[PDB]
Design a protein around this ligand. Structure first.
Ligand SMILES: C[C@H](NC(=O)[C@@H](C)O)C(=O)N[C@H](CCC(=O)NC(CCCC[NH3+])C(=O)N[C@H](C)C(N)=O)C(=O)O
Length: 418
């Protein structure tokens, strides 16, 4: 009897696969709960919001939905909502360099898009009784990340989303901006079907209450909010510079790992630079640490017993990069093979293989970096990642990682001639 089925959205704010496996706010909260129940967690992902509620309410479907949901009516007993675990405020979003709307009326005449079946579509439905001139579009083939992208690039003028979605994604869409809060703050909650037995619901709320206080929720809220992921290019002045101040402390370790693994030490050093700017005490709330930013797991798998030791960190991250490169399909030849190895280092081999399958179906060459790097940002677009085996990944940040490591590599190559 020991298997909790939880239905969710495949999206960065809820549940997704990265290079280490499953992750996401909802995914963890649901995992720390199935642990507290002594059962196996089975994640199931819905096609869109209507379908989530449909699967929740058909027999015999999933136990609960954990998916950043805004509770509906309390006197509707068909669906029942847990206590709230996170507070958000819906926000109108516009693009920088356009007329910032200041109040609900200003939405008339703009192109507006929201997820179909959402809290946020209902808010506009309501607003449209008060202003029949309002027009807006609804879609099941987008996620909140698509909407922000569409605003960012100017394919639509405005959207409406929860503020936590904005905290999560803002950094990856430089052109987007809050126009105004549009509704009162409210708390998200898990959704269970109604309703005759309260066994589960009572356990859910005991958990969500214990997780606040005990800090668990604020723990999570901070790991994921505002977080950067892949560092920006620092420019020639700063690299300058760290070449002078930092590299000489570590060059010998890069050179020795280079010999040991029969590979260009300058590319190892470039990775290290993108990962930590050559700082052996660097860390993230995401659980990587050291000069090459290894996870505990990857560190153990590579013989690394102290992640804060530069020589060990450099030895293990390099081993990891080189093994990833060796495991790629034989049809990928150098120099592309190294660029694919960097892409997998960041996004994981599974997402990378989906991008290669996608490229093929597009009539492109799946052994060429210039082709597959065109596919990678589509893994952030629902229309595309829903047709893939591993779903969403922030593929545009993978591309940025590879480009940045190649820029540092090219400079290092230049100052190390002839
Ligand atoms: C906590 C977690 N996300 C986070 O980033 C963490 C860091 O805070 C989360 O649960 N997020 C969801 C994200 C996406 C979302 O906006 N989902 C919708 C659908 C999007 C509609 C926008 N056009 C919703 O709010 N509510 C559903 C529709 C509902 N009321 O049933 C949420 O805030 O909701």
């Amino acid at each position: 009897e020991g298997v909790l089925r939880v239905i969710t959205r495949n999206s960065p704010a809820t549940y997704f696969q990265d290079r280490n496996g499953e992750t996401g706010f909802e995914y963890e909260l649901a995992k720390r709960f199935a642990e507290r129940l002594g059962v196996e967690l089975k994640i199931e992902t819905a096609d869109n919001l209507d379908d989530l509620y449909a699967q929740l309410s058909r027999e015999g479907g999933p136990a609960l939905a954990a998916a950043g949901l805004t509770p509906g009516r309390e006197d509707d007993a068909s669906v029942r909502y847990s206590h709230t675990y996170l507070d958000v405020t819906p926000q109108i979003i516009y693009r920088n360099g356009q007329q910032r709307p200041t109040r609900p009326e200003d939405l008339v005449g703009k192109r507006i898009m929201v997820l179909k079946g959402s809290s946020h579509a209902e808010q506009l439905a309501e607003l449209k009784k008060q202003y029949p001139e309002l027009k807006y579009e609804e879609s099941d083939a987008v996620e909140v990340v698509d909407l922000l992208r569409m605003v960012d690039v100017g394919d639509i003028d405005l959207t409406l989303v929860d503020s936590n979605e904005l905290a999560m994604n803002q950094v990856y869409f430089p052109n987007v901006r809050v126009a105004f809060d549009f509704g009162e703050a409210r708390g998200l909650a898990w959704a269970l079907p109604g309703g005759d037995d309260d066994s589960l619901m009572n356990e859910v709320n005991a958990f969500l209450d214990q997780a606040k206080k005990e800090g668990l929720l604020q723990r999570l809220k901070d790991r994921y909010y505002g977080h950067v992921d892949v560092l920006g290019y620092v420019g020639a002045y700063t690299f300058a510079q760290h070449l002078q101040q930092r590299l000489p402390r570590y060059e010998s370790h890069f050179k020795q790992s280079g010999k040991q693994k029969d590979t260009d030490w300058r590319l190892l050093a470039a990775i290290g630079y993108q990962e930590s700017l050559w700082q052996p005490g660097a860390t993230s709330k995401t659980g990587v640490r050291g000069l090459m930013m290894l996870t505990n797991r990857t560190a153990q798998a590579m013989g690394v017993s102290n992640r804060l030791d530069p020589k060990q960190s450099i030895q293990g991250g390099s081993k990891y990069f080189v093994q990833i490169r060796s495991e790629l399909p034989e049809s990928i030849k150098e120099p592309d093979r190294s660029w694919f190895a960097l892409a997998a280092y960041n996004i994981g081999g599974a997402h990378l293989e989906d991008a290669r399958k996608m490229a093929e179906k597009e009539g492109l060459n799946p052994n060429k970096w210039l082709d597959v790097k065109k596919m990678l940002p589509r893994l952030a677009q629902k229309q595309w990642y829903a047709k893939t085996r591993y779903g969403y990944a922030r593929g545009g940040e993978t591309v940025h990682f590879v480009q940045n490591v190649r820029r540092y590599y090219d400079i290092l190559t230049w100052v190390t001639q002839p």
